[PDB]
Write a protein that binds this ligand. Structure first.
Ligand code: SOA
Ligand code: AG
Ligand code: CA
Ligand code: CA
Ligand code: CL
Lengths: 16, 303
């Protein structure tokens, strides 16, 4: 639905 | 980039540095991809002719045994150890292992696992005792640069990585040609089956494979496609390389600033039905202190 993700980043899990 | 280290750089001879490396002569190649199904945000295109100076590149991704020797000699503490967690694929987390509630948006198969790191790749209770010759994983870009510098080497640029991975073929899909399993033979370790629910292991492995698994490419490099993503030196962008200039076509280094570093080659998780990123032109990125169970690196060197 959006571009597939192969590189999981430490920044990506920060959300509040 | 200006890294900081807490270990001195040892003296090494050219002969020592070149062991396990192949010499790629100076010349040109056709970098990039124009597959109509490529995701625009990846910037696989344009296809362009790039000239590179001669360089050396590792035949194998850096192994656990090699990373262990680096850590033994330097006391290096990896980013995953400092943070206290790394990303593990869901199917590889043993039941009951403590896990964080962390969510990678759009990718729920990634689990943040306290205590997962290069020597315990699935978290506390796992080990690498049976994986000495597998690629080291849970190494960030910073960890890769630290290793490479200690070894007397560096990371390859994206263009160096791709020239070496293409192995003397002009604009082929994969390192060995245009067919994924020529003659019915698996040539790389990627996913088979239904991602992310079930990996059939048809190619022999549902995790990493030894760094010397499968046939090499025409230049003698192993597992450039599949196995683990490989850090490169460049900052990521989707469009810096669309410019036609000496900076983008002769020994290109990528943009001077950025937020994520390039990774090449795909991994044991890649599959045509999801990412389709095990083609040699494919590319993605990750932020430089990030680490995961499917990402490692190989080194390059100036002769
Ligand atoms: C969404 O666009 C999506 C989701 C899964 C796999 C591919 C793509 N393009
Ligand atoms: Ag992928
Ligand atoms: Ca596999
Ligand atoms: Ca690879
Ligand atoms: Cl092994």
């Amino acid at each position: 639905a959006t571009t597939p993700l192969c590189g999981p980043s430490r920044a990506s899990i920060l959300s509040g | 980039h200006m890294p900081s280290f807490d270990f001195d750089i040892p003296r090494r001879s050219p002969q020592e540095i070149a062991k396990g490396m192949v010499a790629i002569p100076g010349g040109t190649f056709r970098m990039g991809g124009e597959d109509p199904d490529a995701f625009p945000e990846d910037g696989e295109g344009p296809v362009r002719t790039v000239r590179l100076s001669p360089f050396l590149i590792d035949r194998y991704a850096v192994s656990n045994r090699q990373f262990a020797a680096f850590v033994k000699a330097t006391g290096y503490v990896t980013d995953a150890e400092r943070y206290g967690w790394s990303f593990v694929f869901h199917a590889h987390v043993a039941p009951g292992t403590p896990v964080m509630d962390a969510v990678v948006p759009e990718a729920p198969w990634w689990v943040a696992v306290p205590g997962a790191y290069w020597k315990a790749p699935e978290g506390p209770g796992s080990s690498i005792t049976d994986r000495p010759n597998h690629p080291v994983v849970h190494v960030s870009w910073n960890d890769a640069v630290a290793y490479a510098t200690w070894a007397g080497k560096r990371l390859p640029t994206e263009a160096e990585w791709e020239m070496a991975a293409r192995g003397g073929l002009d604009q082929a899909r994969y390192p060995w040609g245009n067919e994924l399993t020529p003659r019915g033979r698996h040539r790389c370790n990627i996913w088979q089956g239904t991602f992310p629910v079930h990996d059939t292991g048809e190619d022999g492995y549902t995790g990493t494979a030894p760094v010397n698994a499968f046939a090499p490419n025409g230049y003698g490099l192993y597992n450039v496609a599949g196995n683990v993503w490989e850090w490169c030196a460049d900052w990521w962008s989707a469009d810096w390389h669309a410019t036609e200039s000496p900076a983008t076509r002769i020994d290109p280094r990528g943009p001077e600033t950025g937020t994520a570093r390039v990774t090449k080659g795909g991994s044991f998780l890649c599959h045509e039905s999801y990412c389709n990123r095990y083609r040699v032109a494919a590319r993605t990125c990750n932020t430089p202190d990030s680490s995961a169970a499917h990402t490692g690196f190989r080194c390059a060197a100036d002769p």
